[PDB]
Amino acid sequence: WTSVAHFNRERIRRGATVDKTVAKKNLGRLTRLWLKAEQERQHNYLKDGPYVTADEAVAIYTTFVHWLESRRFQPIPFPPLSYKHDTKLLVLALERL
Amino acid sequence: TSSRALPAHLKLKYRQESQGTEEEVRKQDLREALLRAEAAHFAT
Amino acid sequence: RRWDEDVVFRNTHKGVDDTPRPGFVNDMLRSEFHKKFLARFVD
Amino acid sequence: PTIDEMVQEEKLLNKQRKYGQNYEYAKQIAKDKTYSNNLDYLDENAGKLSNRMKRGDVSLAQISSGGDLKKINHVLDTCPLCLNYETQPLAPVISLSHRAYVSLPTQPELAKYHCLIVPTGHRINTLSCDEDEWDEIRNFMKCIALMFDSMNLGVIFYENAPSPQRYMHTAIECIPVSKRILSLAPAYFREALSTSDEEWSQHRKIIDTLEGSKKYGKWAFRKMMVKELGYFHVWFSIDGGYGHVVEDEKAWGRHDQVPRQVFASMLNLPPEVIRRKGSWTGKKDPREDMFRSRFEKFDW
Amino acid sequence: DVEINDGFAKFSEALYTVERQAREEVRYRAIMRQK
Amino acid sequence: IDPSIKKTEWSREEDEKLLHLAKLLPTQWRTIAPIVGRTATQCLERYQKL
Amino acid sequence: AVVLHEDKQYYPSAEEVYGSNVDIMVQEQDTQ
Amino acid sequence: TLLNRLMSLLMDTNLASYASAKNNVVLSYKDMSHTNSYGLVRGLQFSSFIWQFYGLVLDLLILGLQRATEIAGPADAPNDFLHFKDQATETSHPIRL
RNA sequence: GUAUGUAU
RNA sequence: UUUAUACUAACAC
Ligand SMILES: [Zn+2]
Known part of the structure; x- marks a missing residue:
């Protein structure tokens, strides 16, 4: 059952097959075969613990701080209750939906 | 009866004298050709 | 060699070689083949 | 039947825009029950899919009002x-x-x-x-x-x-x-x-x-x-x-x-x-x- | 029944100190820049 | 609704470790739930809000 | 110390299960 | 976790909680599902913004702080898409653009 | 109201 | 005469 989802994803990559049935089935069989292995990549991240290692994260954070420091960067606040732009912003959001 | 059940390959192909006749296997000493082949593969 | 002095990280990918690619596995879902097959046909 | 009679049937349809030869074709498919959508089958039937124009009637009462009674009257009753x-x-x-x-x-x-x-x-x-x-x-x-x-x-x-x-x-x-x-x-x-x-x-x-x-x-x-x-x-x-x-x-x-x-x-x-x-x-x-x-x- | 490894705890608290320390480094910088 | 959920009771000594993971992860509330055992992340968020 | 998920090899070498005087032949591709 | 900290810089601490939380989620398809602790999920309307600023990090480990400030130039008046102020700064590094 | 079967 | 259900449906918009 795994074998086949290999063999038919490489008669589609190529071109040979058609009719949804096969491009429908061997899209399912993948979607499982992939969820199976996005499950393990999670479980075997809490069991094997963070891969970053604090020392690496410390550098990455601190170096990032110096970059924002260099810019004279102002952090983005929480939307004021009297904000002229929000009505405009909302409409855009819906128009996108 | 069908298409597939028509005359085809009316001739068999018996083993010619060089490619592996059953008589040549008797005179062959399988035993020694086996061991010698293993040694060669192993050494490499 | 002052450009390589500024890098906040160092030889990270230093021992990157070998891997179990030689080792055959009787588990179609956890071979290397399959890790490449899902590597490619997604994202 | 008859040509002078048939001319009368054609002008009556002309006023009723909702029903023509497309509705008799679309009605016949829903009514047919057994309908495979191919070219082999659509030829084997052929005549059975066009056949209709028996149930069509009403004459003047249909056209005088137009666009249904229940629909337009409901619009007219509410129309602000x-x-x-x-x-x-x-x-x-x-x-x-x-x-x-x-x-x-x-x-x-x-x-x-x-x-x-x-x-x-x-x-x-x-x-x-x-x-x-x-x-x-x-x-x-x-x-x-x-x-x-x-x-x-x-x-x-x-x-x-x-x-x-x-x-x-x-x-x-x-x-x-x-x-x-x-x-x-x-x-x-x-x-x-x-x-x-x-x-x-x-x-x-x-x-x-x-x-x-x-x-x-x-x-x-x-x-x-x-x-x-x-x-x-x-x-x-x-x-x-x-x-x-x-x-x-x-x-x-x-x-x-x-x-x-x-x-x-x-x-x-x-x-x-x-x-x-x-x-x-x-x-x-x-x-x-x-x-x-x-x-x-x-x-x- | 599943549990987290000890390294996770290490990682969390390691970052808290960086955010605390850096915050003071910013306030050190901000005070210097006022002169 | 299901039986596996633990609706009733919350036992103090078992609970001081449930607010401990919030120090570790910060948000991440669905990975906390299978550890904390009480599940129903809603209540696991509301309990730390008490 | 940290074994990144990419490496995390679950099973043991084909050798160390016999790993001495036995021949471990991995044969995917044909010859001839 | 790292994202949560990095995020906390760019904006108010309350907003950044949303984003980080938003990413955890349960993923579902037919018979099966699982939690999403490790990965970053794109479905979110703002998952662009997350990936661009966290991509920013991955540039500031290649470039280095020194070079990066030269390319972007002053924050008060940054350089063009592919231009500099001086020929000296342009030739200082092997990495031009 | 047929596709498909039961009775004379 | 009123209310509900199904059958009329081989209906109609
Ligand atoms: Zn009107």
């Missing part, structure tokens, strides 16, 4: 304007013509002297109106324009009827806009109309009555545009205009916006005015009274 002896409209109304009138719009409001012409009869598409009824609309157009000419302004009017299946009244609305902003509008719309709808349509976006009026000023719109199907139309002066016919109305805008969004940009208003909601109700004096006294000087 339609001026009769029996029914009085929800709009306050300013000046009454014999077959038309001016009245004030909904509460959101696009401009301070925003109005709308409305025919008395249930007309839908303003192309379906009688040439007798259209002449009253023209006298309204000139007097309304001349009212805003003293104000130094000018006006753009329009009407939007993307769906006549719904069977709604058509309100030709007047929008007071300054002359320098008026001269830009020919651009704005020309962009909006070509952009709005999908551009594989047959009808071709934009149909200028402004050039057609030089050929026939009395009626360019009425000659060029067609009544039966959808449509939208703007105009400048008495008989100028840009014209686009609407297809895929779901894409266009069910609540009126494609035009209102253009005026929301051209005139420039907040994004809360863009959508028109509310009702006419009645007895809204303080806003509609200021228009009547001003209008009466220029109004026949």
